[PDB]
Amino acid sequence: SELVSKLRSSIYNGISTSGLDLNNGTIADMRQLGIVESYKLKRAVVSSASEAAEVLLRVDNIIRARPR
Amino acid sequence: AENARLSAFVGAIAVGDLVKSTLGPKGMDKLLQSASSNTCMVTNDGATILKSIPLDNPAAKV
Amino acid sequence: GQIISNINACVAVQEALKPTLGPLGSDILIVTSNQKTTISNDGATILKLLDVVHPAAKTLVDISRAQDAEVGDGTTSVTILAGELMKEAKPFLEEGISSHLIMKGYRKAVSLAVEKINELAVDITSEKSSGRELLERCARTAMSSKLIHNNADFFVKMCVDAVLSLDRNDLDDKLIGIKKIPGGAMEESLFINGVAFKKTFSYAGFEQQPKKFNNPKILSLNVELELAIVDAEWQLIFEKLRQVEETGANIVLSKLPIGDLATQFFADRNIFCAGRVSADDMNRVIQAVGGSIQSTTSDIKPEHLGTCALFEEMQIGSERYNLFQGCPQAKTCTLLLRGGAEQVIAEVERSLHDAIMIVKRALQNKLIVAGGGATEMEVSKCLRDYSKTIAGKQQMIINAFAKALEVIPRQLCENAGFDAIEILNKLRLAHSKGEKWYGVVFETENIGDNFAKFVWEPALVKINALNSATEATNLILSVDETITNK
Amino acid sequence: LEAKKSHILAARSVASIIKTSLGPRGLDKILISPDGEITITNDGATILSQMELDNEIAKLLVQLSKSQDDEIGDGTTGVVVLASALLDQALELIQKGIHPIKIANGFDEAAKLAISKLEETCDDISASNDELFRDFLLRAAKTSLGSKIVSKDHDRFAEMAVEAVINVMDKDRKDVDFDLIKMQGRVGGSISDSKLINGVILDKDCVLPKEGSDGVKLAILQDKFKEMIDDVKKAGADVVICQWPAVRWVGGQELEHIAISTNGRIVPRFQDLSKDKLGTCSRIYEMLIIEQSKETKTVTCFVRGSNKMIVDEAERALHDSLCVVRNLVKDSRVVYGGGAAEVTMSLAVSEEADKQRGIDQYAFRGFAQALDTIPMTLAENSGLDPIGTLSTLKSKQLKEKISNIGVDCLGYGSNDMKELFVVDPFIGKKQQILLATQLCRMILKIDNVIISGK
Predict the structure, then answer these.
(1) Contacts of residue D27 in chain A, CB cutoff 8 Å?
(2) How far apart are CA D451 and CA D445, in angstroms?
(3) Do chains B and A touch (3 or more CB pairs under 8 A)?
(4) Domain co-membership, D258 together with D280
(5) Residue C138: which CATH number?
């Protein structure tokens, strides 16, 4: 609760370099901490999770056929 | 219709609670013990875990 | 006592067919181990696939299988009478009355019944209705008494014209066989004057097949054509192809399929050939084109080759079939069913095959009586007055058979939703003070005259109905014990 | 009557399975094959045909949709919904004491009124030139046939399939060919990698063209290996396909499309090789690509995809368009569906009920109410109130003479089907109504179901 509330208020002021430090349990700079990920890794997990999950979104009932 | 949307959405929730933390050193793990052959695997990623565990949930095929 | 236990198991046979009586009747669904869906009103196909327990159930099956020869239609209003005679006879069997008096008294009632049926049947001939009339106007509702209610108006202007080509004293049932064509409409079925069969196999030149022939000639050959060894096997098949061309046959029917060598030789010369010819289709050509079947090429001669007027390649239902027209001798007109539903094709298949039986018996003798179940009412009315003076106890015995015929109007009211008592009171005065011909009318939902209704039924159906129900009911009473080993 | 009451309730449960799949917007449901494989497709005819239930009443609807798949192939959900709607009204009229045939007689008479009313709404698209006519065929698949996602713009691989049947069919606007039009799939790449050529591409195993010949001299068929080459040198064929350049383990049926397009023949044995079987092929180059630049009716669309269901669902949508285009070319009667003709034909039957009165007034009302189930089902699938949707359609069709106003599933704005280019075959809606009522008459005749002993 408190850690996410401080992180949500940090980006609310226009600071995109903040983050969640699990070692010290506080808000720290991700660039100085050493946490960096590629943009292609971001687009791959976000776009695939939204499109692949559409199978169970539009299908509210599943019917299985008996073994032949 | 009531349990149709429930059992389908919880297919990844039941065995996926341990792999949610996979990113980061604090990630929880899962132990898969075979009934024979004296084999097993320990990993925090659900890739090998899902493929090596047969499930009757139709949503697991997706 | 042992017969009573056997009757109760046989009562449910016609009680499942209970609603099926009349043109408003229903159908029975049967699913076998092969998952073959069969929906039909005729009880012959029902009793054939019906699981039997006691041997008395097979008695009704043997009569139903023999019903096609005696009558062939109206099986719903016939077989049900065999169970009704034994239903009301239960109080008599419990008393000191022996089953022999029931069997002996039954023949005395049928002898009086058939005498009245022949009296009801009247043949005027003279200037009254003739061919193309009796088979149309009076046979409008007579051909199909159960199914094809909405499509009846279509077949009267079609199916009647097909059976008109059948002359009396011949009555060939081998050439009336139909085919199953998926897709299309019922009223759009084309009339076929010759042998037509399915290809059952696809060709690479299927689209390149010749469209039509001016003077085709059909030849039936059983020679199998299939390919130093290479030159020998290819030459022997080539020599057989040249000997066939010497006869000048534009159409060659082969029992076994042919390879590419026989196909390419016939395609360049524009010679038609068809493989996988069934043995039943060969006998159909012999009675139409008049050819012959040659096993080998030793005895083949030019005079064995028949001919027909013209050939045509018909494309229907996204598939092409062989069509013959203008055969030298054709006693009937081939009909091809259509529609997308397989059950509907099999539904009218049993109905059209039952309609030809009327044309068969009409050509021998032309007779019509009042239909709609009014035949048994006039017979039952006459048996009540005669049986009083006939051989003692036979009064109550015949009266039981007289009341057994009352099930027919009770069944017609069950489907139409009428009252069983109300129809008996109106017919009792209609068959006594109203003379005879007044029947029941389903359209106006009241009692009226079948003479002005135009609905008649052949009296020959009721004649064989009592004879078919004679040995059927007598066998139940003549068997007092049933033994099943293991 | 109690036996058929449970059959109608069981038939309504079957229609509720595909109820959400009705229309192009209709959502599918996950189907599990008995072998464990999952089947995900937006085609209503594919899921219903592969699904097998217990009661025989559901199996009777399978045979009804089986004929719809081989004829129409797209939109078979409305066949079961219309058939179930006639049975839903049977719980009332039959309970009132009226015989089913009396109700069935009103359906056949009302069907002729719907066909006659649907014929007046026919709009001929062949009256214009070939530029606007061929454009309507491509735009016909742009909206009505579009179902699955990513289909928003499908015209990349669709125009190849639309123009495929155009070059095969003659300009007299009457043709049918089911022999040479087939779909050939490939697992890999993307759906955008498809190509349109004249020929066939197989999975089994270049030369410059010549002057007189059409090039490559295609002929369909160590001492013995060189001896057969000398026979090829007599005809001069550059590329020769040897079944029994050379290929290994090729099928006979796969080579049929090559011999027909190139006017060649199958050579049973090397002794029968002749020059008369020499064909013409424009170019052959590598998986060899067979192309023909001459006039022929053989056209095969090579399709690629990352999964089997992606290629299978794409082909079934393009293969079913053959019957759609044929009804837009060979058949000059073209009508606008999607809530337009369904509501229009329902208003004509409703007026006939008050004219005849008697027992046919309630019988004709059941037929008009059955046709109103399609827009109410599409309203729930589109997120619109069924009562408010039909109240808007009927209000505009009575006040205005335009009969093309219909249900809008995807939010196209104006409900006019003429501006949205939503077309349905005229013979399609005719066969769906007749064959559905054809089965409903047999359902009402069911008394006792006989099943063989297990």
Answers:
(1) 58-59
(2) 17
(3) yes
(4) yes
(5) 3.30.260.10
